[PDB]
Amino acid sequence: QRIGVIDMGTNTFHLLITDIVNDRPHTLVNEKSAVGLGKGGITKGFITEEAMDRALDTLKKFRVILDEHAVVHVIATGTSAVRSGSNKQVLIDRIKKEVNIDVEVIDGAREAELIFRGVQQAVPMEDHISLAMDIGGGSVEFIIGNKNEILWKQSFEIGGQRLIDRFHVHDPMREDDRVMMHNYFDEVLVPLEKAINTWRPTQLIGCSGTFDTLAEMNIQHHREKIALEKQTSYLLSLPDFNRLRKQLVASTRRERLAIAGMIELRADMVVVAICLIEHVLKLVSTNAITVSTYSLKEGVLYTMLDGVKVGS
């Protein structure tokens, strides 16, 4: 039948609708909407009224699109901003009343697992031990695995909206800001360092909006005739990453707002995100970065198609 998946992310909500004919899935809708669920509240442990109202607006629109495609099987996941918010049940109950969708709140571990199922479908890793990283506005998930297995995974509440709200990063970034961020990452990421030492991944994979934007910027810079919508991976060399890093660290918020595809909430957090990627790169001896165009919503879909329960 047709399957609809909603990812209620901290910055951006996503809607994926897939038809599955002759056991082959085909995308009917892949839509996003900037919601800013974390704005004004995430580091203080709540969701604001304005953010809840934006969320409901977007969900009313997504409900129309679901109905316009006669979708029967729907699953809507709530992740970092939803699970973190003391008033999450207010939002969940408003959603049920307004559009008759039940939000499935998933913890960080399960979010990481589901993301990696999407990565496995997008990037054929063979037996290569790989570190995948998903940077969102609220959390960052890290998974070590290969085509068949997850060896280790962990979610950390260090998504970009949290980072820019908890710390004062200057516009543009200063040397002392770089010290601040990498010192913080040193403290937070100890379990990641330990896992990397244990499993020795040899490749780095990134997914979600920050990585999609880096890919799109690189495509434009090299004048590549590549629609990222029509392929499931994109390899970014380390020299290309370092060009983008230098460009974005030097940039102002206003300059970033002018980059094609760089939505406002991503412009706000992309510099701290690139600092985190650099930090992780120094821990791995990868040869390049592979961007997976699949992330949580695709992992949910493929988990469903596998015949496996999504929640937990």
Dihedral sign computed on CA atoms, order 58, 274, 157, 104: positive
Smallest distance, Å, CB 35 to Cl ion? 18
* Residue among 4 and 38 whose Cβ is closer to Cl ion: 38
Contact 76, 55 (CB under 8 A): no
- Residue 265 CB, shortest distance to Cl ion, in Å, is 16
Closest residue to Cl ion: CB criterion? 108
Contact 135, 275 (CB under 8 A): no
Closest approach of Cl ion to the CB of residue 157, in Å:
6
Q: Which is nearer to Cl ion, 46 or 211 (CB)?
A: 46
Judged by beta carbon, residue 80 or residue 292, the one nearer Cl ion is 80
Q: Which residues are near Cl ion by CB under 5 A?
A: 43, 107-109, 162
The CA–CA distances, whole Å, from 127 to 113, 123, 134, 199 equal 18, 12, 21, 13
Nearer to Cl ion (CB atom), residue 166 or residue 282: 166
Enumerate the H helices of 134-234 as residue ranges.
160-166, 175-188, 190-199, 209-221
Q: What is the dihedral of CA 206, 207, 209, 211, to 10 degrees?
A: 30
Which residues make beta-bridge pairs with 292? 207, 233
Least gap, CB of 154 to Cl ion (angstroms): 8
CB of 109 to Cl ion, least distance (A): 4
Q: What are phi and psi of 309, to 5 degrees?
A: -65, 135
Complex with Cl ion: residue 25 or 145, whichever CB lies closer: 145
